[PDB]
Design a binder for this molecule. Sequence first.
Ligand code: ADN
Ligand code: ADN
Ligand code: K
Ligand code: K
Ligand code: MG
Ligand code: MG
Lengths: 380, 380
Amino acid sequence: GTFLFTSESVGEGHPDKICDQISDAVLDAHLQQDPDAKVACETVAKTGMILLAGEITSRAAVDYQKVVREAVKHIGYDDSSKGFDYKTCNVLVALEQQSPDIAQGVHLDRNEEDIGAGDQGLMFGYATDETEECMPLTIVLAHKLNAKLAELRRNGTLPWLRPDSKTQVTVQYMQDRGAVLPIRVHTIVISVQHDEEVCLDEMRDALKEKVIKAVVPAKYLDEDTIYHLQPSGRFVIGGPQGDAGLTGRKIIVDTYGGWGAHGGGAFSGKDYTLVDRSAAYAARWVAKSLVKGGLCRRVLVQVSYAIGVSHPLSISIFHYGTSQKSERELLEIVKKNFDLRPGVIVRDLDLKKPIYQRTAAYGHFGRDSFPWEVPKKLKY
Amino acid sequence: GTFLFTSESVGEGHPDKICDQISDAVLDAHLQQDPDAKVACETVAKTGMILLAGEITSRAAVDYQKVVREAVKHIGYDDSSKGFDYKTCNVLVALEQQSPDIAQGVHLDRNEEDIGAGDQGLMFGYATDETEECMPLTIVLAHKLNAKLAELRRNGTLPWLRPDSKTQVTVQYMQDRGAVLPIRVHTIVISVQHDEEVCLDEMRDALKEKVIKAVVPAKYLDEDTIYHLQPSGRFVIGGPQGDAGLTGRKIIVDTYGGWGAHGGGAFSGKDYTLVDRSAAYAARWVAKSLVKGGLCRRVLVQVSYAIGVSHPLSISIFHYGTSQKSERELLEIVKKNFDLRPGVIVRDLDLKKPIYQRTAAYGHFGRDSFPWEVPKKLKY
Ligand SMILES: Nc1ncnc2c1ncn2[C@@H]1O[C@H](CO)[C@@H](O)[C@H]1O
Ligand SMILES: Nc1ncnc2c1ncn2[C@@H]1O[C@H](CO)[C@@H](O)[C@H]1O
Ligand SMILES: [K+]
Ligand SMILES: [K+]
Ligand SMILES: [Mg+2]
Ligand SMILES: [Mg+2]
């Protein structure tokens, strides 16, 4: 009755995550000046280059050079020896207004409450009672391993670390009436960029003693756990020099690590009218409210939209058999307690607030008591 | 016992799909000259611009200007009146060699059979007996609606159509012992770019009579079906001018439309050593072989890898209760019949053949009898 499940995460300096953080830094900069900014900012990163591409309509005056470079500085790429330097990289901007055809169809002359969806699409929310934060253990551990690397890099415990890292965690689970119970960690992978001077054995020892053992509860680790630590043997070249980055290429790292489902939309760089983000946040909020409310132990929520239409086209609830109530009953409860119009979500989840850069690494869910992580008390 | 499920698809000229097709055109061009080319080609599209970014190590001599422009020509963007023209757009190239640190860790001096994975990561395969091609009806219909638009555009039946389109299909399903049974189409969305001269009513009538009714079996369509046709009211600006495109931003459109699961990796622009693609193809192949072999009606397969390691780190089978055999038994059958090392997958699925551009629109699965769509006869 046991099975394996694997999730991955990446660090703040993984080239794809760099792009997500910059895109949300641009979004936050606009919202600080114009809460109703329309933002669709894609970022591309390669050796020596940050490119901004997309559509922004805003009353703000934003210094893109400063915003991008400050974001890269925060990540830690501040010297050519590290492969990338905020002081001297190229920043290119290819930003235009929102298409007037889109503007007239989505929000122009529409009361905020009844604004249309900024696009069609589908979105999922997921929650599982296997952790206090209602997230799969596989991805929670994966995120925390990268966070520990960043912590030990910035505090100088491991000065040889560089910002680009990847982790992967395989957990053995037990089935429990549709719910899942973690038993043990089966395999951990860690690859992290490092300086030229540190040897492989020193790095592998540190990754086991100072990162994994400092992160993963001992009850999940045993003599049989498999460790793949710096399995490439050498990872000096990294960041954008090692691998092109793009916004929206870590959407499973951003959400549930393969558990639940995904509708395909990226989060970073998008204002609240773009339901790919806001509706995914709302769907998480619904799912966690159902689990924390004791109606189920594990649940998947789908919603979908049409461009220009405020009300969702479909809503679906899948509880994996972990509720006494039928899925139909849960759907009725959701409809009585939630209003998933984008012009209502924005108020409930405070999505004009410039807090988006905080979401763009280590997952959008399970952390920091964002509004979508604070369950709603359900009436039924 | 009924529920809704929604999937979307996009056309060949959706800016994200444009990028996928160009990336695979570049991949195919290299493989035509060098079957062992190492390719990691990202594409970015915005008004007037195609940018290539990434890492290629190859003995080929490729004319990127010709390959990109020929791909855009094939899609149909051949005049400024359409928003984009292969003859006069900018093509920028930021391509470098594969990182030597990656090269030494993955494939250098390693027998082809025992080559390491080109990265860590997780991948899923999925199959469902609800259609002959073992795909969810929602996404099959969504793809076919875009294909019909492209057919009627290219054959001149609807000369006002332009290449950029999106569709979305909501199906009502019935539960059947873990399997799913389509009952009816609940909602269809179609948005497609059009010329300035055609009126909204003419377009909406054509989309219902010449596209939907020509694609969707009448048994699924009834008086209650909801149609959202050109719901924005105007879609003249489109393609990259309307919305920035990036490679790997339609990964759910590329796979199962929200059904099953996804590990996060993009397909287009990647050679066989990059398991994000090859292992996803192999996982589809496993899943379809199990369903077509009569061992289950609906199944999800996970695999995962570590960079530099040939053998998978984990394999998992989820059959939704649609088999008499346990999931453990199915896993044993998979292990006896499949070898999921990347240096074996390449031989079984012929992944050095330059056929990748054919996969980059209308989904990678359920079509064209690619090698991963031809089930393996299982011994057990
Ligand atoms: N030499 C290497 N060893 C391990 N991981 C690497 C190496 N070079 C790059 N990576 C990571 O793998 C990703 C994909 O190549 C990169 O973005 C980086 O995070
Ligand atoms: N005016 C419009 N109406 C409907 N869909 C549109 C419009 N403009 C662009 N789109 C589609 O929506 C996507 C996201 O904006 C675009 O890439 C395009 O496919
Ligand atoms: K890449
Ligand atoms: K976009
Ligand atoms: Mg990537
Ligand atoms: Mg997109």
